[PDB]
Motif scaffolding. Structure first.
Motif, PDB file in Angstrom:
ATOM      1  N   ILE A 121      -6.028   0.914  16.312  1.00  0.00           N
ATOM      2  CA  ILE A 121      -5.622   2.099  16.951  1.00  0.00           C
ATOM      3  C   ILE A 121      -6.067   2.880  18.254  1.00  0.00           C
ATOM      4  O   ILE A 121      -5.497   3.206  19.271  1.00  0.00           O
ATOM      5  CB  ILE A 121      -5.689   3.834  15.800  1.00  0.00           C
ATOM      6  CG1 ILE A 121      -5.364   3.740  14.205  1.00  0.00           C
ATOM      7  CG2 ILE A 121      -5.708   4.640  16.203  1.00  0.00           C
ATOM      8  CD1 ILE A 121      -3.889   3.760  14.328  1.00  0.00           C
TER       9      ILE A 121
ATOM     10  N   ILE B 271       0.629  -1.115   0.389  1.00  0.00           N
ATOM     11  CA  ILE B 271       0.088  -0.585  -0.052  1.00  0.00           C
ATOM     12  C   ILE B 271       1.331   0.973  -0.068  1.00  0.00           C
ATOM     13  O   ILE B 271       1.593   1.040   0.683  1.00  0.00           O
ATOM     14  CB  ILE B 271      -0.842  -0.423   0.978  1.00  0.00           C
ATOM     15  CG1 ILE B 271      -1.887  -1.435   1.801  1.00  0.00           C
ATOM     16  CG2 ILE B 271      -2.095   1.144   0.892  1.00  0.00           C
ATOM     17  CD1 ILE B 271      -2.337  -1.162   2.581  1.00  0.00           C
ATOM     18  N   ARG B 272       0.795   2.276  -0.777  1.00  0.00           N
ATOM     19  CA  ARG B 272       1.025   3.853  -1.186  1.00  0.00           C
ATOM     20  C   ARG B 272       1.599   3.814   0.687  1.00  0.00           C
ATOM     21  O   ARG B 272       0.427   4.304   1.493  1.00  0.00           O
ATOM     22  CB  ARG B 272       0.550   4.693  -1.288  1.00  0.00           C
ATOM     23  CG  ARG B 272      -0.014   3.991  -3.271  1.00  0.00           C
ATOM     24  CD  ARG B 272      -0.930   4.567  -3.263  1.00  0.00           C
ATOM     25  NE  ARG B 272      -1.116   6.139  -3.940  1.00  0.00           N
ATOM     26  CZ  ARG B 272      -2.537   6.186  -4.332  1.00  0.00           C
ATOM     27  NH1 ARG B 272      -3.141   6.260  -3.698  1.00  0.00           N
ATOM     28  NH2 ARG B 272      -1.831   8.249  -4.678  1.00  0.00           N
TER      29      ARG B 272
ATOM     30  N   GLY C  99      -7.698   6.097  -0.509  1.00  0.00           N
ATOM     31  CA  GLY C  99      -6.007   6.419  -0.736  1.00  0.00           C
ATOM     32  C   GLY C  99      -5.659   4.651  -0.807  1.00  0.00           C
ATOM     33  O   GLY C  99      -4.860   4.471  -1.408  1.00  0.00           O
ATOM     34  N   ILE C 100      -6.874   3.508  -0.262  1.00  0.00           N
ATOM     35  CA  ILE C 100      -6.092   2.644  -0.834  1.00  0.00           C
ATOM     36  C   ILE C 100      -6.620   1.825  -2.256  1.00  0.00           C
ATOM     37  O   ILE C 100      -8.007   1.228  -2.039  1.00  0.00           O
ATOM     38  CB  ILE C 100      -6.816   1.417   0.127  1.00  0.00           C
ATOM     39  CG1 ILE C 100      -7.149   2.330   1.567  1.00  0.00           C
ATOM     40  CG2 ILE C 100      -6.349   0.476   1.004  1.00  0.00           C
ATOM     41  CD1 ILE C 100      -5.461   2.631   2.197  1.00  0.00           C
TER      42      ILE C 100
ATOM     43  N   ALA D 240      -3.532  -1.716  -5.068  1.00  0.00           N
ATOM     44  CA  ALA D 240      -3.060  -2.239  -4.263  1.00  0.00           C
ATOM     45  C   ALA D 240      -3.207  -3.168  -3.284  1.00  0.00           C
ATOM     46  O   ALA D 240      -3.244  -4.411  -3.959  1.00  0.00           O
ATOM     47  CB  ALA D 240      -3.360  -0.941  -3.062  1.00  0.00           C
TER      48      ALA D 240
ATOM     49  N   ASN E 286      -9.350   9.966   3.325  1.00  0.00           N
ATOM     50  CA  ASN E 286      -8.766   8.798   3.016  1.00  0.00           C
ATOM     51  C   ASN E 286      -8.800   7.406   2.228  1.00  0.00           C
ATOM     52  O   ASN E 286      -8.272   6.690   2.280  1.00  0.00           O
ATOM     53  CB  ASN E 286      -7.106   9.147   3.233  1.00  0.00           C
ATOM     54  CG  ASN E 286      -6.344  10.368   3.105  1.00  0.00           C
ATOM     55  OD1 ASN E 286      -6.426  10.821   3.863  1.00  0.00           O
ATOM     56  ND2 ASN E 286      -6.441  10.847   1.637  1.00  0.00           N
TER      57      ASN E 286
ATOM     58  N   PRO F 149      -0.132   7.911   2.102  1.00  0.00           N
ATOM     59  CA  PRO F 149      -2.071   7.836   1.087  1.00  0.00           C
ATOM     60  C   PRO F 149      -2.719   6.772   2.980  1.00  0.00           C
ATOM     61  O   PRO F 149      -3.358   6.976   3.723  1.00  0.00           O
ATOM     62  CB  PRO F 149      -2.004   6.987   0.175  1.00  0.00           C
ATOM     63  CG  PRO F 149      -0.801   6.932  -0.211  1.00  0.00           C
ATOM     64  CD  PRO F 149       0.264   7.067   0.181  1.00  0.00           C
ATOM     65  N   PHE F 150      -1.813   5.955   3.042  1.00  0.00           N
ATOM     66  CA  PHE F 150      -1.583   5.113   4.553  1.00  0.00           C
ATOM     67  C   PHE F 150      -2.133   5.621   5.667  1.00  0.00           C
ATOM     68  O   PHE F 150      -2.984   6.300   6.532  1.00  0.00           O
ATOM     69  CB  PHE F 150      -0.852   3.489   4.985  1.00  0.00           C
ATOM     70  CG  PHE F 150      -1.066   2.717   5.482  1.00  0.00           C
ATOM     71  CD1 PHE F 150      -2.075   2.119   5.225  1.00  0.00           C
ATOM     72  CD2 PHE F 150      -0.347   2.935   6.972  1.00  0.00           C
ATOM     73  CE1 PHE F 150      -2.641   1.278   6.609  1.00  0.00           C
ATOM     74  CE2 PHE F 150      -0.750   2.050   7.940  1.00  0.00           C
ATOM     75  CZ  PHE F 150      -2.126   1.091   7.205  1.00  0.00           C
TER      76      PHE F 150
ATOM     77  N   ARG G  13      -2.258   8.482   6.075  1.00  0.00           N
ATOM     78  CA  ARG G  13      -3.241   9.609   6.008  1.00  0.00           C
ATOM     79  C   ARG G  13      -4.125   8.938   6.461  1.00  0.00           C
ATOM     80  O   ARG G  13      -4.545   8.984   7.307  1.00  0.00           O
ATOM     81  CB  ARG G  13      -3.393  10.059   4.903  1.00  0.00           C
ATOM     82  CG  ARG G  13      -3.812  11.187   3.704  1.00  0.00           C
ATOM     83  CD  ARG G  13      -4.329  11.030   2.583  1.00  0.00           C
ATOM     84  NE  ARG G  13      -2.461  11.955   1.765  1.00  0.00           N
ATOM     85  CZ  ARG G  13      -1.845  12.384   0.751  1.00  0.00           C
ATOM     86  NH1 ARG G  13      -2.307  11.309  -0.067  1.00  0.00           N
ATOM     87  NH2 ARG G  13      -1.354  13.182   0.655  1.00  0.00           N
ATOM     88  N   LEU G  14      -4.142   7.972   6.281  1.00  0.00           N
ATOM     89  CA  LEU G  14      -5.358   6.914   7.044  1.00  0.00           C
ATOM     90  C   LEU G  14      -5.574   6.707   8.087  1.00  0.00           C
ATOM     91  O   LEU G  14      -6.284   7.273   8.772  1.00  0.00           O
ATOM     92  CB  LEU G  14      -5.596   5.907   6.013  1.00  0.00           C
ATOM     93  CG  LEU G  14      -6.748   4.390   6.712  1.00  0.00           C
ATOM     94  CD1 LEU G  14      -8.033   5.099   6.626  1.00  0.00           C
ATOM     95  CD2 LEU G  14      -6.962   3.844   4.918  1.00  0.00           C
ATOM     96  N   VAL G  15      -4.236   6.270   8.322  1.00  0.00           N
ATOM     97  CA  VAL G  15      -4.177   6.079  10.159  1.00  0.00           C
ATOM     98  C   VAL G  15      -4.109   7.864  10.724  1.00  0.00           C
ATOM     99  O   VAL G  15      -5.521   7.499  11.467  1.00  0.00           O
ATOM    100  CB  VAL G  15      -2.420   5.905  10.158  1.00  0.00           C
ATOM    101  CG1 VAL G  15      -2.332   5.569  11.859  1.00  0.00           C
ATOM    102  CG2 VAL G  15      -2.518   4.383   9.516  1.00  0.00           C
TER     103      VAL G  15
END
Ligand SMILES: [Mn+2]
Ligand SMILES: [Mn+2]
Ligand SMILES: [Mn+2]
Ligand SMILES: [Mn+2]
Ligand SMILES: [Mn+2]
Ligand SMILES: [Mn+2]
Ligand SMILES: [Mn+2]
Ligand SMILES: [Mn+2]
Ligand SMILES: [Mn+2]
Ligand SMILES: [Mn+2]
Ligand SMILES: [Mn+2]
Ligand SMILES: [Mn+2]
Ligand SMILES: [Mn+2]
Ligand SMILES: [Mn+2]
Ligand SMILES: [Mn+2]
Ligand SMILES: [Mn+2]
Lengths: 97, 110, 85, 93, 96, 108, 79, 97
Positions: free
Chosen positions: C49, A25-26, C11-12, C16, C8, A29-30, A32-34
DNA sequence: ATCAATATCCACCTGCAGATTCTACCAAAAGTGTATTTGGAAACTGCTCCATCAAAAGGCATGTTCAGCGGAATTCCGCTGAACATGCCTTTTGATGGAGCAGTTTCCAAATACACTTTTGGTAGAATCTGCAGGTGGATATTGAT
DNA sequence: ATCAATATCCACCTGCAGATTCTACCAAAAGTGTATTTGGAAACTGCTCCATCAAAAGGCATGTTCAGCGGAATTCCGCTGAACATGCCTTTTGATGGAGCAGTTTCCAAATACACTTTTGGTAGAATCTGCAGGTGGATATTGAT
C-alpha cells in the motif's frame, strides 16, 4: 458413525484447492483491512475497484507461495506439521526482513 | 504495403518502432531493430499461445483462460523461468502433493 | 450502541488461512501459525500500500488505481498479470 | 483511446488454432506479457548501447538483448525469427 | 582520455567533518559505485514516474517521490530534507 | 560579471552541473527540470556523507584512521537503513559481521 | 579436474566464515556443484557482453554488468 | 601429548575467519576453472586481471552467504552438521532452480 | 581445584607500499546572454464508477466434543567427521616480448525532420451466435471398520 | 478378503454471460518522398597490462585415533483434525448521489538551442610525509588432563 482418519479430509482439501483458483479470503473483510492499512498513510482515499483485486490476488499469491516453502521447512525437520518456526525460516531464506 | 507485411509479421512493426522512440532507450533507433523486435515479440506470443491452448485442449475446453496460461507456464522449463517472478491473476498453482504427506505403507499389487 | 464496528486484521479468519496453506500443500497446521500468518500478511499489504499510494499522491489523485497497486508491486520484484500495464 | 496488442495476439492465435478462443482476462494477461518482455529487451538493448558508447539501438543490440534476457530454447528460436523477418524486410528491397 | 568520478568530492565531504581520517583506494572505488548505483536507482524511478503521468519532464517533484520510494524510512526523511533545502537555498537566484 | 557555481549556490560540494549533464544524456526523459539536478545532488552528497560518517566510525572504533572496505561493510551491515538499501550489494573485501549461532557454543 | 582444484580446505574455510561448525562429507562435491553452476550463469552473461563489445578480452566491467543483471550487484571494481 | 576436543579448533577457525576478509580460494585453481568454464562459450578468450578478481570476490561472497543459510537449515533440523540436504533446502528457499 | 600446553592480548617500535602537499598545464566543463520554442499547470466540465444503505438469504465462520496420531522428550550405539603431524607438488612471486584494447581522423550510409497523404486498428453499438458453469443421476472408486 | 458409507466421476442438459459477427465514423497512426544532420564502422598503431615461465615458498594431501553427533527405536501425552450444530455477516442486486478521474483548450514560464567566456577537476609525477601490517617478547585468558 462414520469417521475419516485424521489427515484424510485434509488431503481432500489440498487436492481440492489446488484444482481451483478462486480467492480464499473473504472479499469485504479483506477490503476492510486494505482500507485500514491505507488510512495510516492517506486519509479519505478512494480505491478503484480492481486495485483491491490486484491487491488481493497479489497477497494470496504470496501467502500460498510462502506456504509451500513453509511446508518444505517442515518436512525438513522430519515433520509434517507447519510450525510458526517454519514460517520464520521460510521467510528468512527467501530473504525477507 | 506495411512493414509488418514487408516482414511476414502480424505484429505491428510500425507501432513497436514508435514505442521504442517515444520510450527513451537510445538517442537513435536503428531502422531494423523494430523489425527484429516485433518478430521476437510475435514468436513468444505464439509460443505461449501454443502451450496455453494445449492446456485448455487437455482440459476438454476451447476457451483459453488464466488457469491454462498459468499451467502452460509453470510446466515449461523455458516459460516458467522467463516468468519466475510474475504472478498470473486467477492462475492457481500446479497441482502437487509432497510424498511425506501421502497415506499408507506399500499396498500396491504384486 | 447502534454505531459500532472494529479494525480488521482478525478479519482474516482461521478458516481462510487454513485454505491458503491448503492450496500450498500444507496438511497439518500448528495453531501458532494463524496469528503468525496474519502478522506477515499485514506487513505485506502495508509494504505494498505504502509505495502504491506514494503513486496516487504523486498523481495528485485521491483514488488508488490498479496500475497503482501494479507499479507498486513491480517496483518490488513481485510482478502481476491480469490488471493492466 | 488506449492501445494494446489484443488484435494481433488473436490473429496469431487463430492462424494456428482457429477453433481455440481466448478469454477476456487471458487476453489482458497476454498483453502484459508482451509489454513486459518488450520492456526487458528494449531496456537491455538500451544498456548494451549505452555501455558501448553508441547513440543507436540497432537490431544488433536487440539481438544480444534477446540472448541475455531469454532462456536457451526461447532465445535460439527468437534470434532466428528475428533475423528471418529483418532479412525478409530487406528482401522487399 | 579523461574519466571523471565523484572521488574528489567524496573525499572533500569526508574531510569536511572528520579531518584526521582517510580513505583507501578500494574504499573510494566502492563509495563511487555506491553513488552511481543510487544515482541510477533514483533517476530511473523518476523516469518511470514522469512516464507514468504522460509528463515529458523530470522536475524536482519526481526526484522527490523517487527518493521517497527508493530510500528507507529515517533515511528517506533526511534525504528529502537535504533535497528541498538545497533547492530553496538555490532559488535565492539573486544576490546571496 | 563575477559568478559562483550552481553547487556553490545550493550550498553543495557535489557537482550539480555534472549531475545535470548525466541526467539529460542519461536517457531518462525528454526534459530535465532546473531544480531536479540540484535536488538529486543534494540527496547524493547526503548519503555520500552518511556512509562516510558511519564507515568512519567503524574505522575509528578500531583505532585506525584510514577507511578500508571492511569498515564500509561493517558499517553498512550494522546500519539498519543502509543494510536494507544495499542488501543486494556485495562489498569487495568486506568480510562478514562476526556471528556464531548459540547452538554451536557451549555457553558464554 | 580443475573444479576439483577448489580444494577441500577452501570449501571448509568459506564455510567457516559462513559460520559452519561441522561439515558432512558430501558437502564438498555439492559445494563444487553450486560453485560451477554459479560461475557458468555469470560468465555466460559476462562473455556475451564481451562478444557484443566485439573484444577478445573479458573486462572487469563485463563481469560487473553480468553480475548486475543477475541481481548480484558488486562494488569494488568499477561501474 | 596435547590434543584439542572435537570441535574446539572449529570455532577458533570460525572466529578467525569472520574477522578477516582475505579471499579463501587459491587464485590459480580458481583462475583455471574460470577459464575452463568460459571456453564453452568462446575459445581463445583473454581475461582482465580484475575481471577474474570480480568473479572470485562475488562467487566467494555468494558461497559464504549460502553457507550461513545452510547452517540455519541444519539448526532447524536440530543438527549442527551441514549435510547435502541442507545446501539443497537453502537453495530451494531462494529460487535458485 | 591444579597445573601445564597454547591461544590470545597489547602496549612498543619500524620499513614500504601508498597517501600527501605542491606547483601546473588544460581539454572540457560549467557558466552566461539573447532568441526561439512548448508541454503542463490552471480553469472548465462531461460522465464513469466509487461509496453507500437496503433487506432478503444462506453460505460459512465459530465453538464444543473426542481421540488418534504426530511431535518431543529420552536412551543407546554405531560411525563419521575433527584433529593432528607430516614432507611433497602446486601455487605464489617477479620479470617480459607483444597481443589487443583504447585513442583519433573520417566520409557517407543511415537515421531524423517536417509536411502530406493513404491506411488501419480501436470504439459506442446492434442482430445474434455459443462455450461452459451449475445441476441431477446412475456407475464406479475410495475409505475404513470388521 | 468382505461389506457400508461417501466421495468422485462421467454423461446428457441448458439458460446466460460473454464471445462472434458486420457496419462504419475517424482520429491518431503509419507510409512516402526529399532535404539534410549525424553517429558508427573503418584504417592505424600508441600503449597498457595479459599470457607465459622459472624458482623458492607454504598449503594441501594423507592415514590414524576416537569423541560425540546423528539417526534409530521407544514411549507417551496433548495438540490439532473430523464431525456436527448454531446464527452471524458476507455476498448479492440494485438503485442513486456525486466525488474525481479524465478529455480539451490554452499561453507563458520554464526549458532547449547555440555562440562565446571563465573556471575547474583530472593528470603526469617529482618531493616526501605516514598509517599500519608485520615481526618481538611477556603479561593474561582459555582449554583439557586429572
Ligand atoms: Mn472436495
Ligand atoms: Mn517444471
Ligand atoms: Mn518448451
Ligand atoms: Mn524541476
Ligand atoms: Mn540509520
Ligand atoms: Mn602548509
Ligand atoms: Mn507550454
Ligand atoms: Mn430472511
Ligand atoms: Mn489419549
Ligand atoms: Mn506416532
Ligand atoms: Mn597489434
Ligand atoms: Mn480495418
Ligand atoms: Mn461442470
Ligand atoms: Mn545427540
Ligand atoms: Mn584546480
Ligand atoms: Mn598489528
Amino acid at each position: 458413525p462414520h469417521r475419516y482418519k485424521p489427515g484424510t479430509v485434509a488431503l481432500r482439501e489440498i487436492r481440492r484447492f489446488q484444482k481451483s483458483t478462486e480467492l480464499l479470503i473473504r472479499k469485504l473483510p479483506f477490503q476492510r483491512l486494505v482500507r485500514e492499512i491505507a488510512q495510516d498513510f492517506k486519509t479519505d482515499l478512494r480505491f478503484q475497484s480492481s486495485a483491491i483485486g490486484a491487491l488481493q490476488e497479489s497477497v494470496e499469491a504470496y501467502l500460498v507461495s510462502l506456504f509451500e516453502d513453509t511446508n518444505l521447512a517442515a518436512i525438513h525437520a522430519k515433520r509434517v506439521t507447519i510450525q510458526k518456526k517454519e514460517i520464520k525460516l521460510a521467510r528468512r531464506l527467501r530473504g525477507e526482513r | 504495403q506495411s512493414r509488418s507485411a514487408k516482414a511476414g509479421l502480424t505484429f505491428p512493426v510500425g507501432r513497436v518502432h514508435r514505442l521504442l522512440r517515444r520510450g527513451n532507450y537510445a538517442q537513435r533507433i536503428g531502422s531494423g531493430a523494430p523489425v527484429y523486435l516485433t518478430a521476437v515479440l510475435e514468436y513468444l506470443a505464439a509460443e505461449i499461445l501454443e502451450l496455453a491452448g494445449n492446456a485448455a485442449r487437455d482440459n476438454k475446453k476451447t476457451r483459453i483462460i488464466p488457469r491454462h496460461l498459468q499451467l502452460a507456464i509453470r510446466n515449461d522449463d523455458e516459460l516458467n523461468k522467463l516468468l519466475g517472478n510474475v504472478t498470473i491473476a486467477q492462475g492457481g498453482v500446479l497441482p502437487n502433493i509432497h510424498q511425506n504427506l501421502l497415506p499408507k505403507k506399500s499396498a500396491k499389487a504384486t | 450502541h447502534r454505531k459500532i464496528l472494529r479494525d480488521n486484521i482478525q478479519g482474516i479468519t482461521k478458516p481462510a488461512i487454513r485454505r491458503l496453506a491448503r492450496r500450498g500443500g500444507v496438511k497439518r497446521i500448528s495453531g501458532l501459525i494463524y496469528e503468525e500468518v496474519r502478522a506477515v500478511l499485514k506487513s505485506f499489504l502495508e509494504s505494498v500500500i505504502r509505495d502504491s499510494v506514494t503513486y496516487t499522491e504523486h498523481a495528485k489523485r485521491k483514488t488508488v488505481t490498479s496500475l497503482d497497486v501494479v507499479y507498486a508491486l513491480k517496483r518490488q520484484g513481485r510482478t502481476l498479470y491480469g490488471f493492466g500495464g | 483511446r488506449k492501445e494494446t496488442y489484443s488484435s494481433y495476439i488473436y490473429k496469431v492465435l487463430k492462424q494456428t488454432h482457429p477453433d481455440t478462443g481466448i478469454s477476456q482476462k487471458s487476453m489482458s494477461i497476454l498483453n502484459s506479457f508482451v509489454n513486459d518482455i518488450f520492456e526487458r529487451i528494449a531496456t537491455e538493448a538500451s544498456k548494451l548501447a549505452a555501455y558501448n558508447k553508441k547513440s543507436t539501438i540497432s537490431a544488433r543490440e536487440i539481438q544480444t538483448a534477446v540472448r541475455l534476457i531469454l532462456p536457451g530454447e526461447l532465445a535460439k528460436h527468437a534470434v532466428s525469427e528475428g533475423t528471418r523477418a529483418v532479412t525478409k524486410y530487406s528482401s522487399s528491397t
